[PDB]
From Swiss-Prot:
This protein's encoding gene: nagJ
Main EC class the enzyme belongs to: hydrolase
Protein function: Binds carbohydrates. Capable of hydrolyzing the glycosidic link of O-GlcNAcylated proteins. Can bind and deglycosylate O-glycosylated peptides from mammals. Can use p-nitrophenyl-beta-GlcNAc and 4-methylumbelliferone-GlcNAc as substrates (in vitro).
Location of the region described as Catalytic domain in the Swiss-Prot/TrEMBL record: 139-429
Residues at the active site: D258
Chain residues that bind a protein: G147, K178, D257, Y295, W354, W355, N356, D361, N389
Family affiliation: Belongs to the glycosyl hydrolase 84 family.
Domain GH84: 140-412
Species of the source: Clostridium perfringens (strain 13 / Type A)
Residues of the full protein shown: 41 to 624 of 1001
A single GO BP: polysaccharide catabolic process
EC nos: 3.2.1.169
Key words of the record: Coiled coil, Glycosidase, Hydrolase, Signal
Designated name of the protein: O-GlcNAcase NagJ
Annotated GO MF terms: [protein]-3-O-(N-acetyl-D-glucosaminyl)-L-serine/L-threonine O-N-acetyl-alpha-D-glucosaminase activity; carbohydrate binding; hexosaminidase activity
């Protein structure tokens, strides 16, 4: 009967029947012609779910028809009956399940692969709803830049992320880890033989999952521009791009974010010459990507006008080059429309976003587990390339990334709170509700100086806490609020304990300290209510005892590497410890 959670949210989805059960084996039609990567994803899923593929047609098994438009599969059009991917953008598809048949038709092979990804999420214990779907992304490039500091992702982490990206229709991975010398400290040098299997596996997995593997190069450490030294180095840039092209790389990024020679004319000259002698010469290289030395609005702009570097870089840089920026600051609350309009106007093109959330390198004690937040829903008007910088914690990064998939693919309809719930529901199974209790307290990022972003932690709990203080300081009966808060603090503790016992190690090793910290805080939150009740009861001894625990729990939190719920579970102890009911 019902349509499961879907991510991203399809553009158009109509329920047209009560649904049906897929048979124990199926008829597969269009495999000769249909995108290979998409057929493999389909095969994999079928296997994993014990659905066999018929040698020959029809024990009256379910029929699945797969292809792109323009492929020669007369059965696909019949099954799609009226619905079509032909008028859809690149990466679009149509999917129709009706009365024992399932048709998947991509606008291109990419589209077909994404239709498979949709199909996979639609099927629950062989049961599938009866839907008409047409679907396509809001933003052309959607993905990850691996630009965080700290402990690098492992090879296995990257392979898993790439698969995760394909499943969620993210099509871009910018590979530029701090741990790989061949992107920076040895930027001139081709990868040696001992590194090639590793690199090939990443390239291969990217292609298989329709992920654009973008090689990020940072020559800024020691590149020369002037004269013949300049000449020799441009040529190293070419020979290095070539060695990457030869192992299958089709996208390239050149970063200027960390260079000493801060010359916009020279950065843009390298880019333009590279666009010309490499990108264009090759024919099948995706647009060149760049990070200019000024990459946030505060560094780029002064009194609504571009600063000199940005003025020159923008007037010189080829119109086809994607230019990245982080928003109004490097790590900021938001990108309003007006900011994207400003930077897009300066560059006279659609911009590329390097969004520094959920990255936590600037404040490592805290996990960033909230949704895309603060990004304007009209952003696509000025941006056609959207990436997030994630945490060194690859596994827990998936909650925010999940929401980013939904935001960039279906932006008009993005609802950060429903996207966030659905992320956890989708990733955590029977642990979802406990995982929400914990992650809810761990969305807001703020290093107290230059970097802050994310949804506020536990907003509803923070509002209840606020109500408590104003009831207690207004002589209004606070008993119900006290009772309710006791329930909520007990639940925080119960959820975290179930997560410690049952989360798999891949997640647990990322968050075990933050779990213990939320427990400690819940325990001080409880002692804090005990302090209030003791004052109401005029029991001095019960007051002093509750205060000591509250203080102790807060002291543990403050002395721990792990950070969580600063303004909420933590601040509440501080608030309680300073509160005195006798003065009201
Ligand atoms: Cl998902």
């Amino acid at each position: 009967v019902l349509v499961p959670n879907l991510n991203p949210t399809p553009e158009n989805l109509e329920v047209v029947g009560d649904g049906f059960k897929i048979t124990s084996s199926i008829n597969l039609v269009g495999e000769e012609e249909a995108d290979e990567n998409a057929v493999n994803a389909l095969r994999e899923f079928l296997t994993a779910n014990n659905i066999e593929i018929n040698s020959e047609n029809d024990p009256n098994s379910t029929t699945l028809i797969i292809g792109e438009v323009d492929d020669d599969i007369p059965e696909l059009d019949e099954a799609l009956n009226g619905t079509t991917a032909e008028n859809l953008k690149e990466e679009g598809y149509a999917l129709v399940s009706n009365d024992g048949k399932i048709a998947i038709e991509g606008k291109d092979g990419d589209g077909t692969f994404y239709g498979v990804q949709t199909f996979k999420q639609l099927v629950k214990e062989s049961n599938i709803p009866e839907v008409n779907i047409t679907d396509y992304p809001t933003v052309s490039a959607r993905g990850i830049v691996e630009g965080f500091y700290g402990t690098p992702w492992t090879h296995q982490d990257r392979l898993d992320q790439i698969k995760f990206y394909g499943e969620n229709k993210l099509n871009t991975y910018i590979y530029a880890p701090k741990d790989d010398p061949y992107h920076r400290e040895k930027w001139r040098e081709p990868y040696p033989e001992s590194e090639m299997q590793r690199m090939q596996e990443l390239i291969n997995a990217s292609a298989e999952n329709k992920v654009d593997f973008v090689f990020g190069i940072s020559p800024g450490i020691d590149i020369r521009f002037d004269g013949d030294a300049g000449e020799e180095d441009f040529n190293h840039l070419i020979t290095k791009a070539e060695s990457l092209y030869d192992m299958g790389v089709r996208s390239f990024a050149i970063y200027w974010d960390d260079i000493q020679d801060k010359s916009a004319a020279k950065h843009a000259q390298v880019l333009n010459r590279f666009n010309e002698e490499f990108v264009k010469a090759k024919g099948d290289v995706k647009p060149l990507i760049t990070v200019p030395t000024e990459y946030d609005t505060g560094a780029m702009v002064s009194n609504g006008q571009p600063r000199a570097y940005t003025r020159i870089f923008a007037e010189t840089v080829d119109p086809s080059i994607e230019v990245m920026w982080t928003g109004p600051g490097v790590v900021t609350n938001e990108i309003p429309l007006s900011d994207a309009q400003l930077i897009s106007g300066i560059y006279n093109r659609n911009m590329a976003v390097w969004w520094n959330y959920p990255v936590t390198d600037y404040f490592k004690g805290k996990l960033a587990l909230g949704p895309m937040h603060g990004l304007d829903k009209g952003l696509n008007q000025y941006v056609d390339f959207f990436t997030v910088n994630p945490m060194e914690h690859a596994e827990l990064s998936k909650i925010s990334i999940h929401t980013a998939a939904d935001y960039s693919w279906n932006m008009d309809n993005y609802d950060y709170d429903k996207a966030w719930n659905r992320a956890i529901d989708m990733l955590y199974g029977d642990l979802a509700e406990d995982m929400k209790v914990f992650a809810n307290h761990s969305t807001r990022m703020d290093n107290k100086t230059w970097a802050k972003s994310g949804r506020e932690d536990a907003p509803e709990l923070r509002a209840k806490m606020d109500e408590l203080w104003n009831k207690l300081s207004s002589k209004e009966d606070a008993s119900a609020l006290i009772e309710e808060l006791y329930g909520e603090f007990a639940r925080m503790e119960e959820a975290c304990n179930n997560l410690k016992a049952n989360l798999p190690e891949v997640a647990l090793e990322e968050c075990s300290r933050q779990l213990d910290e939320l427990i400690t805080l819940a325990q001080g939150d409880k002692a804090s209510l005990d302090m209030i009740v003791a004052q109401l009861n005029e029991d001095t001894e019960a007051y002093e005892s509750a205060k000591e625990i509250a203080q102790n729990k807060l002291n543990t939190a403050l002395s721990s590497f792990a950070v969580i719920s600063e303004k909420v579970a933590q601040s509440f102890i501080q608030e309680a410890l300073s509160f005195d009911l006798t003065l009201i």
